[PDB]
Design a protein around this ligand. Structure first.
Ligand SMILES: COc1cc(CCCc2cc3sc(C(=O)CCC(=O)O)cc3cc2OC)c2cc(C(=O)CCC(=O)O)sc2c1
Lengths: 172, 172
């Protein structure tokens, strides 16, 4: 309901707008190597920290991609900013990619805390799963070649960098 | 459902982040007069053009506000851009304000066109109304002093600039 709408809104209002322009931005950054594809982190616990290096020190901020701008609903030159991270493994750089969390999962988290939202805290997991499955279904028929969904459930020793590396290595 | 979630997501993922910083950005622009408050256009027909001057020539782009940046879900310095418009009336500048459409209304429009979205085209109006009422209910208890909702239904001679001016003049 909320998850279904969030997945559609994230796709329509964000991914549909950045993904067609992403490959050219990465090619530009590389010519001035960062992997292609936006790697989207989908923690099913809906824990969305703003600083990726805090979630895993082995996920190290490298640089920002050149920004994309577009006139969007009266916002002239609405800016789309994306960050490049290096993934470390036993002190070695193992991968470089454009990475971010899916921000609707932070909305699901925050909504469950507001009494007026009518969203119970114990419904978070079911809604996160529906969000991930819906987004997967959208991207299958859309965008798909320009991004990779990294959905995961934390157990208490978990490596976020290893989770991303497993997806990055699958691309060969 | 989709409208309820969109209203909550627009508030949590956007308005909650820009509205506390808005007054300082407008004060800065004025000291270097633009009205305070973000004026949000809510067309119940869900018609969201990207260029405001196309919707009404009497709504003239003036300048961008200084951008706001924040680290957001792994996006370092995620940029929030907002545009300042002058409102004209019989060739006279009648008001100056930060104006944009609510982008979730463009999501409602686009969702109704995608077969996979399970959203019928004839449900748009009911969903737009629910989105506007929910956002109003959120802002009443939140942010409210930093923005003004301009919800309207087009009839076939309508002045968008006059609709905004009526709200702007109410602020005195
Ligand atoms: C219009 O519907 C959406 C929905 C999302 C999913 C997250 C929740 C949310 C985030 C944003 S961010 C936002 C704006 O920046 C306004 C202008 C614009 O839509 O581009 C509007 C909304 C509305 C939202 O819920 C409806 C989204 C996420 C976006 C991002 O820019 C990702 C990074 C971030 O969340 O700040 S644009 C965007 C647009």
């Amino acid at each position: 309901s909320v998850a279904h709408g969030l997945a559609w809104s994230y796709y329509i209002g964000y991914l549909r707008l950045i993904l067609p322009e992403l490959q050219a931005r990465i090619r530009t950054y590389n010519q001035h190597a960062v992997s292609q594809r936006l790697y989207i982190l989908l923690p099913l616990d809906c824990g969305v920290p703003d600083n990726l290096s805090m979630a895993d020190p082995n996920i190290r901020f490298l640089d920002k991609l050149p920004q994309q701008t577009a006139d969007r609903a009266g916002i002239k030159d609405r800016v789309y900013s994306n960050s490049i991270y290096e993934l470390l493994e036993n002190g070695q750089r193992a991968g470089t990619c454009v990475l971010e969390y899916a921000t609707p999962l932070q909305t699901l988290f925050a909504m469950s805390q507001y009494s007026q939202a009518g969203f119970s805290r114990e419904d978070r997991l079911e809604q996160a799963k529906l969000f991930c499955q819906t987004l997967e279904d959208i991207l299958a028929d859309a965008s798909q070649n320009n991004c990779r969904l990294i959905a995961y459930q934390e157990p208490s020793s978990f490596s976020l960098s290893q989770e991303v590396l497993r997806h990055l290595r699958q691309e060969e």
